[PDB]
Amino acid sequence: SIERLGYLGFAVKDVPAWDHFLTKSVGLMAAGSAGDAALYRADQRAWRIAVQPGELDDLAYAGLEVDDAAALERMADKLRQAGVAFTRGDEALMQQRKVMGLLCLQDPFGLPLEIYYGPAEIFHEPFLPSAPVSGFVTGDQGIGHFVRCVPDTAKAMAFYTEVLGFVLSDIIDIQMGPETSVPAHFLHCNGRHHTIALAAFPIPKRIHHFMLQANTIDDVGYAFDRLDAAGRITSLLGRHTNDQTLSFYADTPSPMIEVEFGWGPRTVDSSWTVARHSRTAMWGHKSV
Amino acid sequence: SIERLGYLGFAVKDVPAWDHFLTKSVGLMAAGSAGDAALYRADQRAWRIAVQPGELDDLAYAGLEVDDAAALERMADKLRQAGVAFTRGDEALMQQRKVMGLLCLQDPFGLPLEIYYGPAEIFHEPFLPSAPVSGFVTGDQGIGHFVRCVPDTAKAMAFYTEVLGFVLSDIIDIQMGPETSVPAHFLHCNGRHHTIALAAFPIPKRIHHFMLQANTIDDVGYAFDRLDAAGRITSLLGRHTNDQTLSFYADTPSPMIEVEFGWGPRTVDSSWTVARHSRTAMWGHKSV
Amino acid sequence: SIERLGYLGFAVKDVPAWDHFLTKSVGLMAAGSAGDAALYRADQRAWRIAVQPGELDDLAYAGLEVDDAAALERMADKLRQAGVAFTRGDEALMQQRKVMGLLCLQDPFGLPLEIYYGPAEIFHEPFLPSAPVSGFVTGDQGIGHFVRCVPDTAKAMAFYTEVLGFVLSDIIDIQMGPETSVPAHFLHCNGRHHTIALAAFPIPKRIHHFMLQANTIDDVGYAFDRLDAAGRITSLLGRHTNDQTLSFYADTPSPMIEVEFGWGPRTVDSSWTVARHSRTAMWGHKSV
Amino acid sequence: SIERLGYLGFAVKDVPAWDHFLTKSVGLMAAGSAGDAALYRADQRAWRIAVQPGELDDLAYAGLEVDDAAALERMADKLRQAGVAFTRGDEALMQQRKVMGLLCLQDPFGLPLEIYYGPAEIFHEPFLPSAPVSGFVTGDQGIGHFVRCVPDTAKAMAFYTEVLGFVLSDIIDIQMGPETSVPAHFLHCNGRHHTIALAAFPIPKRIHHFMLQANTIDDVGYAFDRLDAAGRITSLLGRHTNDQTLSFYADTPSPMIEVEFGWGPRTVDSSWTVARHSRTAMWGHKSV
Amino acid sequence: SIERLGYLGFAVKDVPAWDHFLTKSVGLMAAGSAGDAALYRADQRAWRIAVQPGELDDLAYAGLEVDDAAALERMADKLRQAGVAFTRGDEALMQQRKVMGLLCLQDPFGLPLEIYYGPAEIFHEPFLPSAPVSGFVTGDQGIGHFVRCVPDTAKAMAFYTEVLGFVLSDIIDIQMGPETSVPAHFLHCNGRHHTIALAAFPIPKRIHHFMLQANTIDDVGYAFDRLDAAGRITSLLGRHTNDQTLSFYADTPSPMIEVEFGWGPRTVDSSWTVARHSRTAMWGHKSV
Amino acid sequence: SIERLGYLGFAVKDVPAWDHFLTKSVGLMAAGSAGDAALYRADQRAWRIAVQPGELDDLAYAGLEVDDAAALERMADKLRQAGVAFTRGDEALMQQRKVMGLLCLQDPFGLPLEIYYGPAEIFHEPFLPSAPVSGFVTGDQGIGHFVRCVPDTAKAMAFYTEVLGFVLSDIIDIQMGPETSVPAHFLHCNGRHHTIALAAFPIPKRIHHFMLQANTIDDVGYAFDRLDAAGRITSLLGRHTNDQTLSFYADTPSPMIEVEFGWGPRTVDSSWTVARHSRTAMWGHKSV
Ligand SMILES: Oc1cccc(-c2ccccc2)c1O
Ligand SMILES: Oc1cccc(-c2ccccc2)c1O
Ligand SMILES: Oc1cccc(-c2ccccc2)c1O
Ligand SMILES: Oc1cccc(-c2ccccc2)c1O
Ligand SMILES: Oc1cccc(-c2ccccc2)c1O
Ligand SMILES: Oc1cccc(-c2ccccc2)c1O
Ligand SMILES: [Fe+2]
Ligand SMILES: [Fe+2]
Ligand SMILES: [Fe+2]
Ligand SMILES: [Fe+2]
Ligand SMILES: [Fe+2]
Ligand SMILES: [Fe+2]
């Protein structure tokens, strides 16, 4: 099974806007380029987020990490047994992604996924944020999370759990209208309360948002002011009912895709219990 | 196997007396109603104790929790293999209990049991006690415990251990007369020393008492005075030989059913050793 | 100023009853005799409590400790400046008390006080309780406390504070009748919330009670049962409003003198604030 | 497999000498009698050591504990599969030992062993030592250890490891003469470095010594002086090479059987490594 | 599988130079001799490094430790199943090495390996360094590590992982020339980030270096000055990218074999993730 | 006032015996020589103990340390005010002692004392013991203590307390005969329970012993065996009543002067209370 989410690649219409957004606002470190993709770092990894020009203005792919070569072969075995098509990344792709091996596939609804192992690290070029942020929480919990929009949650759940090995943490019925709600399913594959959430939202994007977790509450408070100065805030500060992450949301330069910047959630372990919530926030998160 | 005791439902002759008892005396939070049942909270769960009008003046049902949907199906499998009759709760029942799924059955002596998963939580309506209590110890250990009266302890033991997966912690020979004692069996299904105790007591109730655990010794001391002002104390403060819970007992408004309010017991783990005790109290607990 | 209360001497009508009481019930260690006085230990000191035959059935004297020879001379100076009569204990008395020096005086109402330094310790004869008690809290806080009955609290306060250097911690208005209360003044001379309390009670004894503090809550719980078996309990368990000591009271063999056996109070330091309380117990302590 | 050593029974020629030895010298608590056996406690168990009159002047039996009824049946299964004869203790024996069930057998060289579960505890009669000792280290590690004398170490090893489930910790070549040593094998069945050691010593006793572990270094220091006053010291203080227990040895009233009284050893876990030592002491333990 | 690296034996042209090097410079304790081999200690083991005269000027053998006799037989089984030739060490060899049993074999490229259990410890002769070093980090992590030079890394990897049970931690592409690098593979068999690294270096030695880990940073700083006074420094202080060991390198008296003396690395556990690095040092380690 | 004891100088008949004693037995580090004095280290100081040839076979001088130049002038002022003769050490003496300034005087009974400030430290030559000892406890508590023999304790007390600023910790009545004891006075000048003890012993030496404190209990245990192998033990292990130091005594090569090697005492602070003890040992210390 997948151990963690390791990287995200976006294809966007305004690369310079995304560059400024990820560095000056979010605080990531510019890390050069690979082909036509600009690279950004959040820690010791050579890169965590890639941005390339494209009309999609959406997530182009997500990198799903396993711990070793044997693990990758076991994932290939699971894909075969499940009847899910995949192709082994060639040398050129391996060099582009800076990984020792990868399998290329798509989830049931067209999102390209890359399962890999052996990512490149560059401790000789220590991480230096582009904006005031003490650091990000990554490590064994991966880069963060994202909310995957799907037309059929049941179908998506079977794939992510039965094929990829994610596990359901909980469900929140997100109110959409006076008498309409969407049952968002939050999935984990490590200690991070969720790495992927599945939701049947009526937005035309592959994802609703991606999330990064900072080391301190001040990191979040300061980031809010930066994104507010940029005119991008979409929610006030708040704390989630399920993971207890204290965060705020803001627009990325790609319409209808947001970023969530948070701190201090609960983590999960083998004794986790599935529960249901009627609200996304215990407090705050008022839409603006 | 059952992971923890999650809820209790009582059917009583004096609903207002029970309402005052659970709130003003015990300290639970009033949490509205579901049908003809008044609901009470002890933590983030939508409800923990339900009270409905009825001539029983007894425990009407107990909710036994598992961690996920797959776990519930495994319990259904165990019930089938054991020849124990059960029915799947319908949508109406699921909505009434605020759970994602449940199996309805009875123990060998008529106590209705409900095995469920996916309970509702309401962190947006933080718990607020109705009386001075810093909080209750629940979480992975569930709501508390209860002593189940049975006519045949051996038969009850086989069901709770072999079918439901509870495990014997220890036995206390509770003296009843000059030369008569009842071997009470204390069972765990998690870290709580016991969640259910089995005893062949000569009382006409399904249970002898239910127990709630508070966060501090002062919580217990203060609760004693509240219940004493209500004229309900049945024991002085004391500490148990087996779980080392420091508690007192008091009458509920239903004749012959007591409540135990305690603090600071030992917890169990895989290295627990079965032992036998000749007394229920290491000190205190004098009957009054 | 006085550093701590170090010893107590009682003159009683039933020495054997007191012997059994202090050892089998309270848990002190029998430590031989000095003249016609039986000696009892609570720690490394050669003795802490002395019991001698006498019709008083009361506290005969209290030993007030200072840290060195120079300190004792300074106390002699304070007594002289205050016009309080005193005599230096002779060699025989010094040997009897096992101290390097002492001043003999009385408080304004006839209670003999002995200010001393250099007490004897016997670490080669380690303390062994006569009943199950993990140990007592003494050290820099001394042996415990006692409530001194006085006819004139103002006069007593001036002596204990201005002459001996005790400091007021707080006051409790102890209800005596429907519209009658006694303002008990609690005084400290170290970290122990109080070492001496002053109160105008209508009892014919020099003191209302003496108090010993044990290391654990179980120590207290077990002691309660022992004293209850002896038929001596005067209060249920409870916790004080001012020092937060969790204790119970019981009769000593001397009529109208009680013992208090407690655990876990707050301690004081230079930042202590004088306050007033309307009750002696935050919870419990019901009279029996 | 055996979880821990729970009790020892001795048959001796001088019961009063053993009584004084275990209480006044070692510090155990006298705990009445069961038949012609005097009982002694070291903790919450109803008894840990039994002494009965007999010409053996040796260990009469050792109680080997398992955690539950199912565990005991599994041990019966292992004995059957191994061809080791055993008899189930009858009701009278169960009542005598204060256990819920037991299997009676002998090791390959005649030492009676009793495998049991469900021992009686008496927390309402808290442990009170007969001599100054803060307490003993028992719990999951059992009462202590003993060195079993055997004529054939290989044969003894196969039985204790293959049948009873003990595991080798290490070996010490104990020098007997100028060019003669005995390879003592130290075996564990829990965190205690060893519960039983096997050695081909030329003494006519079933065991060389039994060992008790106290809570503090002072406990050991004080016990040394007590046993020295009794004229029983056989070694000066010292510390073992293998378990790092700091102890001393002394004669019991039974010729050639010693007691070891120690503190502060290392404990073992799954990552333990078998090693060999050429000396029993890292320092001290000079024979006297 | 192998649990840890326990000992190293060198065959050298200048025994006196090696003796001075290991004692006065590195700080090991001289521990006598066994045959024509001089012995050196780093902890409680009778020996850790052996030096004997020989033209090789290289590592003569490496001792690979397992936890018990059964483990050794399992390793013999693995060797048989893998078709790897081995011989059981005879009594003379066992006595020479001070072990309870061993298997003698070679890795695919001629390095003699000895798999053993039951090493001798001498706690009665406590370790005393020959130079100022607070101590070495050994224990469950073994003596240290070494970099094994191999002509075929793939072949070496299959043997060390598939046969001996080592596990890949990570890979570093060590730059050799302007457009030439060697993929060094770092392998663990316990918490030590690596115990053996495999690299296709163009040096004529079996190993590139061996490494010892000291308790403090000062240990390393002081050792640097000692080796610098001896004219042996080959690198400045630095910290590795993969294990985060802070160290320096120096020449041993055998040409082209170095020693690494370090402190403070990260350790590994079951959740370790394979990664790739482009540099050996996060900082420092400049060649001199 | 004196801050701590910093150094000791001995004049002895057998320098080689003392050299072996201090290094191979006690564990001090040989530190060259200054004139005809051999120097020994216990920590970062250039020297702590000096040994020179002389018929005295006794302590020749003791170095008493203050924190700065101003402090030394204040001590000169106190000596003048007290009428105690002293001479300022000249440049040659300052260079010999490796100090920035010193005052030379004698105590009332002829022991030369040197009050100094600014001692030399040599961190570039880190301490390396000559025998297995993890280290000594020095720092702000100085090198250790010594027992000063005096003919008139009262006179000695006035000088050490009134002139030098030492403070009485406690008194022990050391039994000399059936009805004879000597009141030993233990004095502190920092956290070390005592730095100098005064006693009217009938020995012809300036001191009874000097004491060094090691970091661990094993340090003490190992040192005992070393001194026992040398045939120098004068007491078994034991623990003192007053400072709770766990130690043993041994003869130095100078007749009637002993060394005490200990661990783990209590320390003193401003809240220390003067007490009296009837024994030097709580346990152990039997004379041999
Ligand atoms: O991390 C999270 C935890 C809980 C809910 C959301 C969420 C809120 C609104 C829309 C979609 C998801 C979330 O992002
Ligand atoms: O929690 C508990 C632990 C031990 C005994 C009891 C008990 C006491 C009297 C009657 C029934 C049970 C109990 O409630
Ligand atoms: O320690 C104490 C703290 C507060 C009140 C009392 C007290 C209660 C009743 C009568 C007299 C004193 C006391 O003893
Ligand atoms: O606990 C122990 C640990 C190591 C050795 C012994 C031992 C010493 C002498 C004779 C027999 C055993 C021991 O008792
Ligand atoms: O411990 C280590 C960790 C990482 C790299 C090296 C290394 C550096 C240069 C040449 C060979 C190995 C190493 O020794
Ligand atoms: O450190 C110490 C603490 C207490 C007593 C002594 C002592 C014992 C015998 C003779 C002289 C002194 C001592 O050395
Ligand atoms: Fe989110
Ligand atoms: Fe209960
Ligand atoms: Fe009181
Ligand atoms: Fe032993
Ligand atoms: Fe290395
Ligand atoms: Fe001393």
DSSP state of A127: -
Strand partners, B117: B101
Ligand 2 pocket by C-beta < 6 Å: which residues? B 147, 172, 174, 184, 208, 211, 240, 242-243, 245, 260, 280
Contact between C253 and C18 under an 8 Å Cβ cutoff? The reply is yes
The side-by-side arrangement of strands in the sheet containing A49-53 is A29-34, A37-41, A49-53, A4-12, A58-65, A112-117, A101-106, A87-88
Q: Ligand 7 centroid vs A194 CA: distance in angstroms?
A: 8
Q: What is the resolution of this structure in A?
A: 2.0
Q: Which CATH class is domain F1-132?
A: alpha beta
> Rounded distance, CA F250 to CA C100, Å?
33
**Residue from B201, B273, B177 nearest D4 by CA:** B273
Query: Is there an atom of ligand 3 within 6 Å of C260 CB?
Result: yes
Pairing of strands C101-106, D238-240: unpaired
CB D282, CB E125: distance < 8 Å: no
Q: How far apart are the first and last CA of chain B?
A: 39
Dump strand ranges (E) for C124-229: 145-149, 167-177, 180-188, 196-199, 207-213
Find the CB nearest C132 among D128, D218, D222: D128
Secondary structure of residue E251 in the 3-state scheme: strand
Both structure tokens of A171: 């469900």
3-state class of B175 per DSSP?
strand
User: H or E element: which one contains A75?
Assistant: helix A69-82
Q: Is D145 known as a binding-site position?
A: yes
Using DSSP's 3-state secondary structure scheme, residue D188 falls into strand
Look-up of token digits 């209850």: C228
- Give D-chain residues touching B283 at CB under 8 angstroms: 124
- The phi, psi pair for B122, rounded to 5°, reads -135, 70
Best probe residue, ligand 3, of C172, C244, C280, C286 (max atoms within 8 Å of C-beta):
C280
What are the respective helix, strand and coil percentages of chain E, to the nearest 5? 20, 40, 40
Burial of B104 (0-12, 13-18, 19+ CB in 10 A): middle
Report the alpha-carbon angle D259-D261-D262, nearest 5. Answer: 145
Residue located nearest, by CA, to atom 12 of ligand 1? A147
In the stretch 185-204 of chain C, residues with CB closer than 8 A to chain B read none
Q: Do B277 and D65 touch (CB under 8 A)?
A: no
Q: How many residues does chain E have?
A: 288
Give bridge partners of residue A177 from the DSSP assignment: A180
The number of angstroms, rounded, from the C-alpha of E112 to the middle of its chain's C-alpha atoms is 13
Token pair in block for residue D127: 């442990």
What CATH number belongs to C133-286? 3.10.180.10
Residue of F23, F24, F128 to mutate, interface with E, max E Cβ within 10 Å:
F128
CB F106 within 8 A of CB F113: yes
Kindly state the tokens that stand for C75.
């106390």
| φ, ψ for residue C48, nearest 5 deg | -130, -35
- Determine contact, residues B183/B277, Cβ cutoff 8 Å: no
What is the C-alpha separation between D16 and D8, in angstroms, rounded? 18
Q: d(Cα C87, Cα C90) in Å, to the nearest integer?
A: 9
Chains contacting A (3 or more CB pairs within 8 Å): B, E
Q: Distance (Å, rounded) from C-alpha E4 to C-alpha E66?
A: 7
Q: What is the dihedral of CA F273, F278, F280, F283, to 10 degrees?
A: -100
Question: What are the φ and ψ backbone dihedral angles of E264, each rounded to 5 degrees?
Answer: 60, 40
How far is it, in rounded angstroms, from Cα D262 to Cα D249? 9
Whether the CA torsion E241, E243, E248, E254 is positive or negative: it is: negative
| Dist. CA A237–CA A75, nearest whole Å | 39
DSSP lists the bridge partners of residue D38 as: D33, D51
Classify residue E35 by burial, with Cβ atoms within 10 Å: 0-12, 13-18, 19+.
Answer: exposed
Q: What is the C-alpha to C-alpha distance for residues B234 and B258, in angstroms, rounded to an integer?
A: 8
Pairing of strands C37-41, C49-53: antiparallel
DSSP state of A28: P
Tokens of E23: 């004692």
Q: Say which residues have a Cβ less than 8 Å from residue E80's Cβ, sequence separation at least 6.
A: none
Give, for ligand 2, the residue of B280, B287, B288 to mutate: max count of ligand atoms closer than 8 Å to Cβ: B280
What residues are paired with A248 via a beta bridge?
A261
Question: Hey, how many other C-beta atoms are within 10 angstroms of the C-beta on C256?
Answer: 16
Provide the chain E residues 77-116 that lie in CB contact (below 8 A) with chain D: 98, 100
For E205, residues 6+ apart whose C-beta sits below 8 A from its C-beta are: E58, E59, E149, E254, E256, E257
Cβ contacts of C20 within 8 Å, gap of 6 or more: none
Token representation of residue C246: 């969790």
Tell me F155's DSSP state.
H
**A179 CB-near residues (< 8 Å, 6+ apart):** none
Task: Tell me what percent of chain F is helix, strand and coil, each rounded to the nearest 5.
Answer: 20, 40, 40
Shortest Cα–Cα distance, C273 to chain B (Å): 23
DSSP secondary structure letters along F44-58: SBS-SEEEEE-TT-E
Q: In angstroms, rounded to a whole number, what is the distance separating the alpha carbons of residues F125 and B257?
A: 78
Q: Which residues of B202-236 are buried (b: 16+ CB within 10 A; e: fewer)?
A: eeebbbbbbbbbbeebbbbbbbbbbbbebebbbbb
A22 alpha carbon, distance to own chain's centre: 14
Identify the residue among C123, C141, C267 best suited for mutation to test binding to F, counting F beta carbons within 10 A and taking the highest.
C123
Residues 6 or more apart in contact with residue A201 via CB below 8 angstroms? A147, A149, A182, A208
What the block records as the tokens of E51 is 């030096």
Domains F1-132 and F133-286 share a fold: yes
Query: What span, in angstroms and rounded, lies between the C-alpha atoms of A110 and A207?
Result: 12
> Cα separation of A176 and A184, whole Å?
12
Q: Hey, what are C78's tokens?
A: 């304070």
Q: Ligand 10 centroid vs D186 CA: distance in angstroms?
A: 9
Contact C52, C36 (CB under 8 A): yes
The CA R_g of chain B, rounded to the nearest whole Å, is 18
| Cα gap F157→E35, rounded to integer Å | 63
- Give Cα D186 to chain centroid, integer Å: 12
φ/ψ bin of B139: left (φ > 0), alpha (ψ from -120 to 50), beta (otherwise): left
Count the alpha carbons within 13 Å of F130 in the hemisphere toward its beta carbon.
17
DSSP F79-142: HHHHT---EE--HHHHHHHT-SEEEEEE-TTS-EEEEEE---B-TTS----SSS---B--GGG-
Task: Indicate the length of chain B as a whole number.
Answer: 288
Q: What residues does D183 pair with on adjacent strands?
A: D173
- Of D269, D284, D260, nearest to D144 by C-alpha is D260
Q: From its phi and psi, is residue E197 left (phi > 0), alpha (psi between -120 and 50) or beta?
A: beta
**What's the CA gap between E242 and E245, in Å, rounded?**
8
Q: What are phi and psi of D154, to 5 degrees?
A: -60, -50
CA-CA distance, D194 to D189, in Å (whole number)? 8
Bridge partner residues of A214 (DSSP): A136
Cα separation of the two ends of chain A = 39
Q: In what order do the strands lie in the sheet with C120-121?
A: C120-121, F275-277, F167-177, F180-188, F196-199, F145-149, F207-213, F258-263, F246-251, F238-240, F281-284
User: Which amino acid belongs to residue D242?
Assistant: N
For the record, the structure tokens of C226 come out as 């022992």
Structure tokens given for D234 = 């056989």
Residue F268 host element (H or E): none
| Residues linked to residue B44 through DSSP beta bridges, in sequence order | none
What is the position in ligand 6's atom list of the atom closest to the CA of F211? 1
What residues does each domain of chain C span?
1-132, 133-286
Task: Give the integer Cα–Cα distance in Å for D133 and D221.
Answer: 10
Burial environment of residue B151 by CB neighbours within 10 A (0 to 12, 13 to 18, 19 or more) = exposed
| D284 neighbors D236 (Cβ within 8 angstroms) | yes
DSSP E36: T
Q: What is the residue whose two structure tokens read 């049945």?
A: B234
Q: Is the dihedral of CA C50, C51, C54, C56 positive or negative?
A: positive
What radius of gyration do chain A's Cα atoms show?
18
Question: Nearest ligand to the C-alpha of residue A284?
Answer: 1
3-state secondary structure of A78: helix
Task: Give the integer Cα–Cα distance in Å for B91 and B100.
Answer: 9
Q: Which ligand is nearest to the CA of E208?
A: 5
Atom of ligand 4 nearest to the CA of D197: 12
- Neighbour order of strands in the sheet with F29-34: F29-34, F37-41, F49-53, F4-12, F58-65, F112-117, F101-106, F87-88
* For ligand 5, atom 12: residue with the closest CA: E147
Strands of C167-177's sheet in order across? C275-277, C167-177, C180-188, C196-199, C145-149, C207-213, C258-263, C246-251, C238-240, C281-284
d(CA C191, ligand 3 centre) in Å: 17
Q: Residue A258 C-alpha to ligand 7 middle, in angstroms?
A: 10
Given a contact cutoff of 8 angstroms between Cβ atoms, the answer to whether A234 and A247 are in contact is no
The 3-state DSSP class for residue A110 equals coil
Q: How far is CA C90 from CA A168, C104, F10, F274, in A?
A: 83, 10, 45, 20
Tokens, residue A113: 């996924």
Euclidean distance between CA atoms F197 and F189, whole angstroms? 12
How does DSSP assign D193-208, residue by residue? Answer: S-SEEEE--S-SSSEE
Whole-angstrom distance, CA of residue D246 vs CA of residue D250: 14
How many CA atoms lie less than 13 Å away from D161 in the CB half-sphere? 17
- Rounded to a whole number, what is the distance in Å from the CA of F102 to chain D's nearest CA? 43
CA nearest neighbour of E119 among E258, E266, E5: E5
**Cα(F280) to centroid(ligand 6), Å:** 6
Q: Do A214 and A224 form a contact (C-beta atoms < 8 A)?
A: no
- CA dist., res. D248 & res. D252, Å (int): 13
Q: Is residue F192 within 8 Å of F22, Cβ to Cβ?
A: no
Q: Which amino acid does the sequence have at D18? A: W
Residue with tokens 């075995």: A77
Dist. CA C140–CA F161, nearest whole Å: 24
Is residue E155 classed as helix, strand or coil in its secondary structure?
helix
Closest among E210, A114, C237 to B247, alpha carbons compared: C237
Q: What b/e string do you get for A27-38 counting C-beta neighbours within 10 Å, with b at 16 or more?
A: bbbebeebeebb
Q: Is the dihedral of CA D230, D236, D240, D246 positive or negative?
A: positive
Q: d(Cα B203, Cα D155) in Å, to the nearest integer?
A: 58
Distance between CA atoms of residues E136 and F178, nearest Å: 54
Instruction: Tell whether F209 is in a known binding site.
Output: yes
End-to-end CA distance of chain E, in Å? 39
Per-residue tokens: B19: 């309402």
CA-nearest of E121, E107, E133 to E222 is E133
CB-neighbour burial class of residue A95 (10 A; exposed 0-12, middle 13-18, buried 19+) = exposed
Hey, what are F285's tokens? 């210390």
The identity of residue A192, as a single letter, is R
Q: Which chains does chain F touch, 3 or more C-beta pairs < 8 A?
A: C, D, E
Method: X-ray
3-state secondary structure of A202: coil
Please state the length of chain D.
288
How many angstroms separate the first and last alpha carbons of chain D?
39
Q: Which residues contact B70 (CB under 8 A, 6 or more apart)?
A: none
